[model samples]
Target: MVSKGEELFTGVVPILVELDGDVNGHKFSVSGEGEGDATYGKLTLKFICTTGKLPVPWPTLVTTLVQCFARYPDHMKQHDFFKSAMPEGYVQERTIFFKDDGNYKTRAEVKFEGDTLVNRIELKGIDFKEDGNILGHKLEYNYFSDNVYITADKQKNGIKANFKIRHNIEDGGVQLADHYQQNTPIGDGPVLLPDNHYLSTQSALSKDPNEKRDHMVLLEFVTAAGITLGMDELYK
Candidate 1:
């Protein structure tokens, strides 16, 4: 969806939401300097969107994330198949740090040890700025779900998965093991999409808006003492 703006009446702007909620009655101008429209090196363009609104400046950490998707065949392509699908953009980029690398945080893990499903999200998020470290807190969401799944963590919410990790470091060491065995649900969180419409990780399924997914009921649908990969998306 396009960002909230009336002046961006031109078809150039996607919508009121895609602009990351920053759109006023002012007009935006995109001037291509280098070579970028789609490709990185080939498409280096400078854009100056002139709008009547001057509310907030850019975020302190404007991370430019690049997700190099593997090429796809023509027959299974969904771009030409779905109408409501949005063209993947930066929203599909940043905020997703993969565990595929050694940068794996010892305290953080999302794994399925065959039967058991173990997961954790321990992130130290301080107020970021151009200078250095800011003030914030390290928060985590961890649980093991064998069957049912709760949508959120609210005091009044259902207790589907009774699991939590409250952390404090001493001498830069955790009293627990560094890593686990299953895997990480490493996907960029949806920054621009609506809360419900956002998918955790982008997959061939995400690209293909027409892809079928009644499989939620089609899987073995089994559970054990340990968590399973089949339920990663269900929990944290």
Candidate 2:
């Protein structure tokens, strides 16, 4: 008999977007909704576009994926130490592989967006007996992207779950600022983000460190979804 965890993880089919596509003009987003427990039921949403095909051995991958949101209750609440640090409404996004019974699958990449979760997608499915675990070593880097990667163990002993924090394109990276007046032009905008903001995930200039000027150093600690540990201060 198949358990809820086994069935949820097993039935989820990840279809790769190998070519260009469009979903109207919506602010594309993806999210996971758990039936009862995090691992009991699983649902994923993705919007990707690629310019080329797979280069042998490797299959076509998502090069234009916008973002992915997941809700694995038990997995989201892992490790007591890291839980208290994040404020309420903080969204966690992690890379996880599914191993049901014997079948296994993984994603090409897991992306993030938003400063605080504004867009949402919900899913509803039939309930089954629950059974599963999120096995893996979790690592978080406190930096601009504050990007988190939860890879499966080499011996395949890692948990079958993933839960990490994320932000959106308009507010998902380092919050670049100017010490001078608010009129000082920084990138495409003159207004500096507050102590609790981040660079937009949709901009190449947002992630570029070399583009920073000497006047943009930050003195106060402003926590954001993409901020790394002890990275509150910014300097040239």
Candidate 3:
């Protein structure tokens, strides 16, 4: 008998977009309803990767994603929450493999994107100090674009930012201001859905207050459908 987690993780078939046309270069890709600019379900959204977290539950993933927006000042604020959520882990870059039922499947990491790196926002258990900090780790709504990738889409832009912050967990939590651009200017625009399955299962726009929890990053959704994908060039 398959549990719900098994079904969600198993049913999610990852189709790879090979780089060298070799099956070895295969990477997860998506392109469908929520794939591009059009929102499908509650707030049709998609997430693609040359790699992905396998054997994870869709509903739980969705629930985990929802927690990212709890105290968000606006939409797409999960990036901000993760900046300080794992202070201890930020000391150094450590490989994070996906764990399900005591067996590791894939890997993930919340790394500090830098060379001028000093403090790591991922480090937890040990309190962080934030006299001066970066916020690019969050407050950035990233997606992909076909333009820079040699494709020809403007609206369908790619994006990915690394926003981090140092707050006073002691006094009402004062957020920090960021000024780095490491992961900004991602792809081009709202990258078209790189996969079909993500468009089908993902989740809806968040409506909860306690949006973030534990040590997971987030994917909060909020859209009006029929977005865009390469219009500036053609439309102009």
Candidate 4:
């Protein structure tokens, strides 16, 4: 869906949640610049994103974080801040370093082992930015499902987030992997569309209304983890 503001939105926007008891808004963004490891010179791109709103579930934002910054994992670690989760065996590599302004800082070095990827996000210090809730103290991605587990260790008080790697088609679409694994029915429309919607590692975010996914579902989770490719869309 559109953002809380009327300003024209750009970048990879994921999951705008409205929870009971809380009034503030929560969402994240990702932007890709260079290519990582395409047949051409396309190399990996760095990403940035912020997290705000408290007492909210981590799963909602977890999948969105990985989906936005996941591409070929950790091939180039040139920057001094570049600390890889999987320093080696990253056939495909992409890195994410969160904004380090003031006392609060968060960073992720995304690594992929074949189809398996590990996105390690580290948080240091605390945030006095907004309501002051611990933000990502301990976060883990459950690729088996859309569940993102979090523990008590972080603190946040303000708004924060962007990184654009590649789209991981999590749900609501027939991924390229699925196309190879299962045979097609061909005639009647299927529950989801196929790889036609998949976006590249460094493509621009689409403004086309019809291509966007205003919300996300469980099926998308399965689709995302399984597929090697992804599509451009606004995820839940």
- TM-score: model 3 vs. ground truth: 0.19
Tell how far residue 105 is off in model 1, in angstroms: 20
Query: For model 1, what is the error of residue 63's alpha carbon versus the real structure, in angstroms, after optimal superposition?
Result: 5.2
Which digits, one per residue and each the tens of the lDDT, describe model 1 over residues 1-236? Answer: 33221111112221111122211222222211111111111111122223333222211111111111111122212211111112222111112122221111112332222322222222222223222111111211121112211122123211112211112222342212122111112333221111111111111111124524211000011111222325456676
TM-scores for all candidates: the values are 0.18, 0.18, 0.19, 0.22
Model 4 alpha-carbon drift over 4 Å, by segment: 1-104, 107-109, 115-208, 211-236
Highest TM-score against the true fold, candidate:
4
lDDT of 3 by residue, 78-133 (tens): 22222222211111121111111111111123222231111211211111122311
Better of 1 and 2 by lDDT: 2
Write down the worst ten-residue block by lDDT for model 2: 177-186
What is the model-wide C-alpha lDDT for candidate 2? 0.21
For model 2, the superposed segments whose C-alpha errors exceed 4 Å read 1-43, 46-49, 56-76, 80-112, 115-236
The stretch of ten residues in a row with the least summed lDDT in candidate 1 is 214-223
Best by lDDT: 4
Candidate closer to the true structure by lDDT (higher is better), 1 or 3 = 3
Expressed as tens digits, the lDDT of each residue in 67-110 for candidate 4 is 32222122221110111112221111212222221122334434
**TM-score of candidate 4 relative to the true fold:** 0.22
**Cα displacement (Å) at residue 85, model 2:** 8.1
